[PDB]
Amino acid sequence: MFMINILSLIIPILLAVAFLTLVERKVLGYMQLRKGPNVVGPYGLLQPIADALKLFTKEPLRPATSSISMFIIAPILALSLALTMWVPLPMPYPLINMNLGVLFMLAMSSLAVYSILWSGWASNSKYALIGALRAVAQTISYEVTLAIILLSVLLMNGSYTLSTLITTQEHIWMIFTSWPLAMMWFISTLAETNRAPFDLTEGESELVSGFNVEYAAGPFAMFFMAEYANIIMMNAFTAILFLGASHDPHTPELYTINFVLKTLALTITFLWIRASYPRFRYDQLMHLLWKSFLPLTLALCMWHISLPIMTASIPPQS
Amino acid sequence: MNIMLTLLTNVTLASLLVLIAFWLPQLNAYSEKTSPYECGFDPMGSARLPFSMKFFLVAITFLLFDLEIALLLPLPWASQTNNLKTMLTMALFLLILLAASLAYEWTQKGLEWAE
Amino acid sequence: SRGEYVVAKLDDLVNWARRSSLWPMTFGLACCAVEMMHMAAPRYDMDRFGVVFRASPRQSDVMIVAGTLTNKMAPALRKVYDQMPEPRYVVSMGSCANGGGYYHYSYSVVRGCDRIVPVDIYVPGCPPTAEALLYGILQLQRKIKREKRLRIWYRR
Amino acid sequence: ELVQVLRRGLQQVSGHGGLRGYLRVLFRANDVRVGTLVGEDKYGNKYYEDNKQFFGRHRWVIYTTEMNGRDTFWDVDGSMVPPEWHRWLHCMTDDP
Amino acid sequence: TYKFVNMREPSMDMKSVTDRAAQTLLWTELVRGLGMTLSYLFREPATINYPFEKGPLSPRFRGEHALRRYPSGEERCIACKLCEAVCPAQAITIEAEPRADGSRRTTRYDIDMTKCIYCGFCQEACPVDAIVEGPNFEFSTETHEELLYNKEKLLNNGDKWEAEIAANIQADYLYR
Amino acid sequence: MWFEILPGIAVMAACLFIPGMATAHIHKFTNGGKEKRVAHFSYQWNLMERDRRISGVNRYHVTKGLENID
Amino acid sequence: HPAAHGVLRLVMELSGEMVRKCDPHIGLLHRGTEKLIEYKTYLQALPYFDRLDYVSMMCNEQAYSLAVEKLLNIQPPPRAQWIRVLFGEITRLLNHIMAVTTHALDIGAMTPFFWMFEEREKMFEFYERVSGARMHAAYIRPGGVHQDLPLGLLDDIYEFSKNFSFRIDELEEMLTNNRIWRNRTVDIGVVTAEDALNYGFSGVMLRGSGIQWDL
Ligand SMILES: CCCCCCCCCCCCCCCCC[C@@H](O)O[C@H](CO[C@H](O)CCCCCCCCCCCCCCC)COP(=O)(O)OCC[N+](C)(C)C
Ligand SMILES: CCCCCCCCCCCCCCCCC[C@@H](O)O[C@H](CO[C@H](O)CCCCCCCCCCCCCCC)COP(=O)(O)OCC[N+](C)(C)C
Ligand SMILES: CCCCCCCCCCCCCCCCC[C@@H](O)O[C@H](CO[C@H](O)CCCCCCCCCCCCCCC)COP(=O)(O)OCC[N+](C)(C)C
Ligand SMILES: C=C(C)[C@H]1Cc2c(ccc3c2O[C@@H]2COc4cc(OC)c(OC)cc4[C@@H]2C3=O)O1
Ligand code: SF4
Ligand code: SF4
Numbered sequence A: 001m002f003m004i005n006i007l008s009l010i011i012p013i014l015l016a017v018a019f020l021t022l023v024e025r026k027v028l029g030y031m032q033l034r035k036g037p038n039v040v041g042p043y044g045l046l047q048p049i050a051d052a053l054k055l056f057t058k059e060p061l062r063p064a065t066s067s068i069s070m071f072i073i074a075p076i077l078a079l080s081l082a083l084t085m086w087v088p089l090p091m092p093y094p095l096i097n098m099n100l101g102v103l104f105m106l107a108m109s110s111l112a113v114y115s116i117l118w119s120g121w122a123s124n125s126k127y128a129l130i131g132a133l134r135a136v137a138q139t140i141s142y143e144v145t146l147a148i149i150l151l152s153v154l155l156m157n158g159s160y161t162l163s164t165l166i167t168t169q170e171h172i173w174m175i176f177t178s179w180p181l182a183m184m185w186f187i188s189t190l191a192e193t194n195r196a197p198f199d200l201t202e203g204e205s206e207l208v209s210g211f212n213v214e215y216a217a218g219p220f221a222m223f224f225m226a227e228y229a230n231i232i233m234m235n236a237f238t239a240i241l242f243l244g245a246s247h248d249p250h251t252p253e254l255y256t257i258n259f260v261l262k263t264l265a266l267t268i269t270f271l272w273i274r275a276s277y278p279r280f281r282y283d284q285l286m287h288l289l290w291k292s293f294l295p296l297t298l299a300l301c302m303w304h305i306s307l308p309i310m311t312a313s314i315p316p317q318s
Numbered sequence B: 001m002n003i004m005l006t007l008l009t010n011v012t013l014a015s016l017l018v019l020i021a022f023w024l025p026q027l028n029a030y031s032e033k034t035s036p037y038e039c040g041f042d043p044m045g046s047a048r049l050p051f052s053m054k055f056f057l058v059a060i061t062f063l064l065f066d067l068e069i070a071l072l073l074p075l076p077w078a079s080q081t082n083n084l085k086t087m088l089t090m091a092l093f094l095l096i097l098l099a100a101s102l103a104y105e106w107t108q109k110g111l112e113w114a115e
Numbered sequence C: 001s002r003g004e005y006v007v008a009k010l011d012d013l014v015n016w017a018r019r020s021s022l023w024p025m026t027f028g029l030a031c032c033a034v035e036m037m038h039m040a041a042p043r044y045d046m047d048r049f050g051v052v053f054r055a056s057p058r059q060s061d062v063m064i065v066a067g068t069l070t071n072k073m074a075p076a077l078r079k080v081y082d083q084m085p086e087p088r089y090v091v092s093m094g095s096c097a098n099g100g101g102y103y104h105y106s107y108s109v110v111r112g113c114d115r116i117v118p119v120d121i122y123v124p125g126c127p128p129t130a131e132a133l134l135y136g137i138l139q140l141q142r143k144i145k146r147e148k149r150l151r152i153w154y155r156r
Numbered sequence D: 001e002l003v004q005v006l007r008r009g010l011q012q013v014s015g016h017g018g019l020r021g022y023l024r025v026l027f028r029a030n031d032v033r034v035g036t037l038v039g040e041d042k043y044g045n046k047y048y049e050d051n052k053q054f055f056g057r058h059r060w061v062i063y064t065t066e067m068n069g070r071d072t073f074w075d076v077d078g079s080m081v082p083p084e085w086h087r088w089l090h091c092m093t094d095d096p
Numbered sequence E: 001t002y003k004f005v006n007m008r009e010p011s012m013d014m015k016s017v018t019d020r021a022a023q024t025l026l027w028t029e030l031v032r033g034l035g036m037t038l039s040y041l042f043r044e045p046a047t048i049n050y051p052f053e054k055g056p057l058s059p060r061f062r063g064e065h066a067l068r069r070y071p072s073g074e075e076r077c078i079a080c081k082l083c084e085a086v087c088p089a090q091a092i093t094i095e096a097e098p099r100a101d102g103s104r105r106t107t108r109y110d111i112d113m114t115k116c117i118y119c120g121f122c123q124e125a126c127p128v129d130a131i132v133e134g135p136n137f138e139f140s141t142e143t144h145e146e147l148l149y150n151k152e153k154l155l156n157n158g159d160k161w162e163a164e165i166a167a168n169i170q171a172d173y174l175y176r
Numbered sequence F: 001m002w003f004e005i006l007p008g009i010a011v012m013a014a015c016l017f018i019p020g021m022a023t024a025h026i027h028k029f030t031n032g033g034k035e036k037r038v039a040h041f042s043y044q045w046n047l048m049e050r051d052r053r054i055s056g057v058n059r060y061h062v063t064k065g066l067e068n069i070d
Numbered sequence G: 001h002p003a004a005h006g007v008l009r010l011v012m013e014l015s016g017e018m019v020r021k022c023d024p025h026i027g028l029l030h031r032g033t034e035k036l037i038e039y040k041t042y043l044q045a046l047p048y049f050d051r052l053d054y055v056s057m058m059c060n061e062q063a064y065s066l067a068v069e070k071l072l073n074i075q076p077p078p079r080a081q082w083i084r085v086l087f088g089e090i091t092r093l094l095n096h097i098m099a100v101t102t103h104a105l106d107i108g109a110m111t112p113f114f115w116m117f118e119e120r121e122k123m124f125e126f127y128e129r130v131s132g133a134r135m136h137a138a139y140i141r142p143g144g145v146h147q148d149l150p151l152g153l154l155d156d157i158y159e160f161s162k163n164f165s166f167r168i169d170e171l172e173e174m175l176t177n178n179r180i181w182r183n184r185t186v187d188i189g190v191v192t193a194e195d196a197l198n199y200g201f202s203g204v205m206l207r208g209s210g211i212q213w214d215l
């Protein structure tokens, strides 16, 4: 019966990823004065299925100079971690209830960078190596700031339990208390998901395809699925963190609908951002994260430590 | 136990997808097809040659800054103590020292990449 | 027979999937690449047919040879064609790629890209209009619709 | 208002010959617009216009399902237009 | 007469400084770009429904070649070889002889369509309007050999497209 | 259309609905129809184990009220 | 490579991602145009200039026509010259749209390309109406122009021209004040005036360095 819950979490996520791609293409098209997929199925609704079927019936290539074990392992790790990050999210009840769910997401997101690193290095090609090193630089840029932002926001929650965030935001959204932290968190989530304007690891215009340039067919499909699942997961995490839906214990699907709508809004905002800005330079991304975000984040961490004591507003939990 | 089952399920699903990807289609692998890609021309050197890191000092600093967040993460629980003044003083001291280290590295050109 | 019906249905499904998702390599040589861009432009919007450019040859299905192929460049075209995983298709667009064109009698020009790679569709014009290239792509889709790999395997 | 847009959609499905004709046009041309029948072709193609659309979408042809010998329900191409309707369809002239 | 594109100096008053600080900290111009894209999202796209809708063309359009006839059904070509002499790509090959009735007609008329640059010089050179570039542009083939037109193919093209070719010529012959 | 993007968004919303409601319904089904008990600390775990012991069917959610006091 | 802008083999020596040396290898689109021109008549060699720079086709036609007219000691009629200047400016609009949008696309902003290529399509329509070809017109000839304008072309050119400034304004809204675009463009590839003159630069590559020169 827990296996059924696992499947009911895994299969819909993959379906949403598949259709996210269609949504992504259509939104970009209409923002570019065109239509996007509207032939393969009514309103392009069968286009993701055709893409999935085409990719998995195409020949997978194993490069001659590549390291076989890491080359095959990296996409498996990417997709498995992308699926695993969903289990502690309360919608409004988590599949897995952790005392420290936030730390769990932090650690697993930190371990998801190795799929790009091992993939790029094991491809044994120059563009893949450049993509992997760009991933190293990206993580060095965003990690500390993201962690300190998370700590500063959760100081008003009282714990690292994700469900408690629903109780914290029963009357007001946390974005009205920490909007300066919310903006930096949103930018850091763009940087963490390798999304425009921070898509340096792929860098199509600069690096052809980046870390996955040598991947074809099914493994490439899994890398794409992992990336889009990460998009949806991170936006759901942001919606839980800063826009708390009201929960009725006898009426939980109201919370589920509200949370899904907020997550879709944030994902559509991601797609909107991709269509509006030029790409950063990765040294410029590091300088942005270390010279602007880091000092403000440190100051706001001090402020959000002092404020609950200042006003006698410390949250309940130990 | 449930988390172990979830991890096993995810890894099994990914591995099964890899197996179908590699065993369903028809493979025609020859030496030209599997050669490394460098935009149509052969690579000059190896991809296993050293690749300079211009952000090496920032990379080293990242280790100490990463341990600082590990130091700072128990603050939600620390805010429940009776000696609130002491805990606040120590938390502010830790953050001030982190900010001072960042300022020192910034002023001495430690954040500029090597040319 | 039941097996023949099953292989025919699976054949139709695979053909539909392949023709409905055709990914050309981001690859242009000369004047014809401008009309290829105009085919990708909003007026024609090839993306609505499921046709998306991708830079890497490993993630591509179609090579549109759009422009003159010179002797100096032919090995690179052959190499990026060889690095395409199968099934792969080649469209020869324009007079220069089809047969040499204006530069047929040149010391430095390959008289048609079909001397280097096998070609599925030839799109005439100097340049072909973006509408003509779209017609060629839909003709390639129809040709993919006609192919029967599973039936041939079954009748073996 | 939005209700008028919904009513426009409802009259669009109504004016395509009912529900099955609506689905036929949607799955055959990926378009459900209604236009004045300019004329019919001797091979079965039908030609419509609507001058309220912008230039390019103001003339169109619903192809026949049965050409010389082949089934053209799904397999259609621009080469099936005869030369006179070819001249009209590409806006080389205003007169049908 | 010249103008400068990047020779402006920012205002240093407190209000301007605070406005620039607000732009830096709250990302006003980025929201402006987002607003531009959002505005485009609600416009009607410029895409047409090919192949059911076609792009506009002109009576001067240069497409597939055709050989024409007089209203009596006699061919217009007299084998003068002016089109062959003017062809910049040497795409036309002509052989001629006296016909059985003494007429000056071709026995070979080939156009290599993979050599042709579709410049229309041949139809300018023709003194009897015998060779024309028609309006057809959807004649992609599956083989290279299908694009090597002989006299039968061109005569067939003329017979097939004459109804539109004559109307196109009637609408443009006063500009020639 | 711009409203042609809506069907795909609707499909994504329907897919994203399923995990939360599936979790809620499975929790109700496997916990006596009254929500899954949360044990973040050992006191709550002790309460759950005591509930399982006094239930007589080895199920914590089987609740014994004031009908067990003779 | 998408950023190669066609057939260019740029061999680069890098230290990390820092560029130590650039070596452009060209000739992947050398078709031997000049020898072929030596094998043609003056009218037969005109369409080669269409295919030299396939974004500024009529400007190349105009340059070749001016050279041949100077060698012939003849003079084009005034209406031909006005048509030449008008279509040269339309061609300049086409070329600048292509250049700016492909530059932005290489940087990472892919949206203005689609906005401006519809205007490019309309100008292609003007080309086709005047000549019967959307790109390679062969319209400007060493004696003037091949054909007169159709009887309603000027109205359509006016209708297009009175709406283009708003498209430029939208492009500038996207790019001009964007801090990301400025970061990717400001102080990048700086060339001095004297270096630009000695290296043989022309056009914008001079005017960007402050040199006041327009032919
Ligand atoms: C969506 C995620 C969940 C999916 C759930 C299902 C999991 C499916 C498992 C994934 C693999 C899918 C592969 C589908 C094709 C089968 C490939 C292989 O198994 O068949 C052949 C296996 O046969 C071998 O040649 C040897 C056969 C016998 C020798 C060892 C097997 C001994 C078993 C005993 C059989 C006797 C009868 C048993 C009755 C039960 C190998 O052929 P090969 O060309 O290499 O590979 C290319 C396959 N092509 C041709 C289709 C492209
Ligand atoms: C005599 C030497 C002075 C000059 C030499 C300087 C060399 C030493 C460096 C600094 C000396 C300070 C260390 C003193 C030990 C601190 C512990 C003690 O003083 O009490 C604490 C008082 O600490 C307070 O926070 C104030 C002192 C903190 C001073 C701020 C940091 C300044 C240090 C800077 C020097 C270090 C090197 C340079 C760093 C920049 C907490 O008391 P309280 O919590 O009630 O009770 C705890 C017991 N309970 C839990 C059972 C209830
Ligand atoms: C439980 C699931 C397990 C497997 C998972 C895989 C997903 C299932 C497969 C999805 C099926 C959807 C494909 C059907 C789409 C057909 C659409 C139709 O329009 O195509 C027509 C023809 O359709 C095809 O001929 C047949 C398609 C399907 C044939 C058999 C399908 C059997 C699938 C059963 C599942 C098998 C999976 C086995 C593994 C378990 C002609 O269209 P076309 O000419 O192109 O377009 C022209 C465009 N115009 C009209 C504008 C001019
Ligand atoms: C990516 C989509 C939106 C468009 C843009 C584009 C294509 C297809 C191919 C290419 C491309 O842009 C790149 C960069 O700009 C030029 C400019 C060229 O000449 C102006 C040229 O000629 C071969 C080639 C190119 C590249 C390449 O071939 O569709
Ligand atoms: S066929 Fe004509 S338009 Fe195409 S590349 Fe060759 S010269 Fe340029
Ligand atoms: S159109 Fe030009 S290239 Fe083609 S046959 Fe006529 S003269 Fe020769």
Ligand code: SF4
Pocket (backbone or CB within 6 Å): E076, E077, E078, E079, E080, E081, E082, E083, E084, E094, E122, E125, E126, E127, E128, E129, E130, E131
């Ligand atoms: S087609 Fe015209 S120009 Fe050519 S040989 Fe015949 S009559 Fe002379």
